[PDB]
Amino acid sequence: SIENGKYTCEEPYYYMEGVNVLGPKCVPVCGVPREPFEEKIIGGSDADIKNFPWQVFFDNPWAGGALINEYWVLTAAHVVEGNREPTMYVGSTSVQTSRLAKMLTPEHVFIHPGWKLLAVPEGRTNFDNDIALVRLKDPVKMGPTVSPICLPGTSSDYNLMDGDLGLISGWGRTEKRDRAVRLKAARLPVAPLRKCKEVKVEAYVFTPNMICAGGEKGMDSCKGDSGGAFAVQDPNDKTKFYAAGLVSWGPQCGTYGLYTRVKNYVDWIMKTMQEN
Ligand SMILES: Cc1ccccc1C(=O)N1CCN(c2ccc3c(N)nncc3c2)CC1
Numbered sequence: 001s002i003e004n005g006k007y008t009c010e011e012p013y014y015y016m017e018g019v020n021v022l023g024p025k026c027v028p029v030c031g032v033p034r035e036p037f038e039e040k041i042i043g044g045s046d047a048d049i050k051n052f053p054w055q056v057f058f059d060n061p062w063a064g065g066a067l068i069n070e071y072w073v074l075t076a077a078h079v080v081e082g083n084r085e086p087t088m089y090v091g092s093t094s095v096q097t098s099r100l101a102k103m104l105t106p107e108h109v110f111i112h113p114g115w116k117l118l119a120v121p122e123g124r125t126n127f128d129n130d131i132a133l134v135r136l137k138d139p140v141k142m143g144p145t146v147s148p149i150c151l152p153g154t155s156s157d158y159n160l161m162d163g164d165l166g167l168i169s170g171w172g173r174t175e176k177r178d179r180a181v182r183l184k185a186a187r188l189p190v191a192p193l194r195k196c197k198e199v200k201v202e203a204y205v206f207t208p209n210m211i212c213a214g215g216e217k218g219m220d221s222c223k224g225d226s227g228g229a230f231a232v233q234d235p236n237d238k239t240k241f242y243a244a245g246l247v248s249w250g251p252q253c254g255t256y257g258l259y260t261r262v263k264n265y266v267d268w269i270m271k272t273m274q275e276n
Helices: 193-197 262-274
Strands: 014-016 026-028 055-058 063-069 072-075 106-111 132-136 165-170 184-191 210-213 229-234 237-249 257-261
Touching: 055 072, 063 237, 072 237, 072 262, 132 262, 165 237, 184 193, 193 210, 210 237, 237 262, 257 262
Parallel strands: none
Antiparallel strands: 014 026, 055 063, 063 072, 072 132, 106 132, 165 184, 165 229, 184 210, 210 257, 229 237, 237 257
């Protein structure tokens, strides 16, 4: 008897890496939602957790994260900077208190060393390296409503280009509410960093570690959405999603926003997880 197996692994959620070659391990399949998101968060539409099974809900500051493996949640630094034991939920379209009673227990929070720590969050101008990892106590059981997202490769076909389409999803501010009750999502293109800089508001810092995204239709993520995955189609498989970006910060809700360029952190991510 192996974990997550019969030897069939429990497919479509797990896969084998098969009195025996070895003389067997069933491990999660990142990136493949059961029902893909259907377009009709600002400028978004209704999303089912099904569409975004990696989506994680942080409660204490209202934020999001992405499940990347059974022990690790990935989020923005700023989201855990001053919440070292965050309350995270998974598996749910509604974040209504009723529906809030699957929860993930944090074991350790790992902030990126290049994040600038602040005692008082208000008026941070510098969101460089807005990336942090959260190790869970118990492994997450995958299914229709809970599965990881893929990470980027360091290969160049992972370099994003202006116009690349991605997904944002969260329970943040909408045109109707300050915090959504049900999951919301939008499709939006990667934009040149000047677009972000041109929204008039010590100056905000823009680094190469930050994706700008947004455009004509004024789709955007906002407060409440932060730490969630900007989900991009795997360069070689259109049905598999990886986290190109993390919802970091933005000059003005409904304009253009800034997302942690995950690719630049893949080595660190990998190393943190191995060494822990
Ligand atoms: C500091 C903190 C810690 C925990 C939870 C929330 C916060 C928080 O309050 N902030 C973090 C997220 N943030 C963004 C991010 C993207 C935006 C965007 N893309 N467009 N318009 C506005 C945007 C605003 C607002 C400030």
